Amino acid sequence: HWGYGKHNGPEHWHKDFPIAKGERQSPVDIDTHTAKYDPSLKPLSVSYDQATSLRILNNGHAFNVEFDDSQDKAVLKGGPLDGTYRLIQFHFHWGSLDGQGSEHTVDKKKYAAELHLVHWNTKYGDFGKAVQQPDGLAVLGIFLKVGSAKPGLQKVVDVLDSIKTKGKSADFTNFDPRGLLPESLDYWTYPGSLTTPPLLECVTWIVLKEPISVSSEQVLKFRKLNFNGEGEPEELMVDNWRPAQPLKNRQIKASF
Ligand SMILES: [Zn+2]
After folding, report:
1. What is the distance between the alpha carbons of residues 159 and 177, in angstroms, rounded to a whole number?
2. What happens after mutating residue 194 to A?
3. Strand partners, 112
4. Which residues are catalytic?
5. How far apart are CA 199 and CA 202, in angstroms?
6. Is 196 annotated as a binding residue?
7. Could you tell me the CA-to-CA distances from 55 to 52, 58, 89, 127 in Å, in that order?
8. CA 48, chain centre distance (Å)
9. CA 72–ligand 1 middle distance (angstroms)
């Protein structure tokens, strides 16, 4: 029964998911002065040439664009990672206003939104097994600021009308996630968690330093989605972000 409201939001999650108060929760504030350059970090390898998108789903918390992860089609490797992580889905977190919406923050700065590209470690065979492992997932996080339109985002914006409410899905084949990336793959990395229930501590976070720019009209269309199901009272899908959690005994490493 979790969500983002006063009554079921992030301050409540710990009662059903006690790991909400654990030692490696996400997101976190990235203090750019405290993050250390780690000259031992490899460049990221983002291999999305054969990515096979299938479907877009409104799950009542966000929308997920789902990929065929039955083979090594779209993978993330290198950087802080050992082995091969397969893309399974991406989604966003966003605000009611342009001054909030990201989950990570940079020197306490909040971006308008944040893209998460979710990948699982192929050595665990399936996603459900991977989330039970401390190195099971790699999530590539990309900040969104409001400015110029992102052309590679418009096919997503265009289909949101068709998945307005919880449980609605649409075919979403032949979408190229390379169109969502910034120019630079410079990043921060730290060990953390899923940012929604069940809040499992299974994620190597890789957060790109360079935000992508989207237009006010693009983000306005995200804010027209609904948390509710069809024929229920309208609740706009906005402010689906968890705030920054304690860093505790963790160091954030910079690739640059
Ligand atoms: Zn997310």
Report:
1. 15
2. Reduced CO(2) hydrase activity
3. none
4. 61
5. 9
6. yes
7. 10, 10, 10, 17
8. 17
9. 22
3-state SS assignment for residue 116? strand
CA–centroid distance, 18 to ligand 1, in Å, is 19
Q: What is the DSSP string of 144-189?
A: EEESS--GGGHHHHHHGGGG-STT-EEE--S--GGGG--S---EEE
Domain coordinates of the chain in residue numbers?
A: 1-256
Method: X-ray
Both tokens assigned to 57:
């789903």
**256 C-alpha vs ligand 1 centroid, how far in Å?**
24
Cα dihedral: 185, 201, 116, 135 (round 10): 50
Question: In the block, which residue shows the tokens 């068709």?
Answer: 162
Cα–Cα distance between 107 and 143 in angstroms, integer?
A: 14
**Under a CB-based contact definition with an 8 Å cutoff, are residues 164 and 226 in contact?**
yes
Q: How far is the CA of 28 from the centre of ligand 1 (A)?
A: 13
Expressed in Å, this structure's resolution amounts to: 1.3
- Six token digits for residue 97: 């206003």
Give the whole-angstrom CA distance, residue 199 versus residue 132.
11
What's the CA-to-centroid distance between 202 and ligand 1, angstroms? 13
Q: Is 33 annotated as a binding residue?
A: no
Residue 32 marked ligand-binding: no
**Looking up tokens 């665990």, which residue turns up?**
124
**Are the C-beta atoms of residues 192 and 30 closer than 8 Å to each other?**
no
How far apart are the C-alpha atoms of 134 and 242, rounded to whole Å? 21
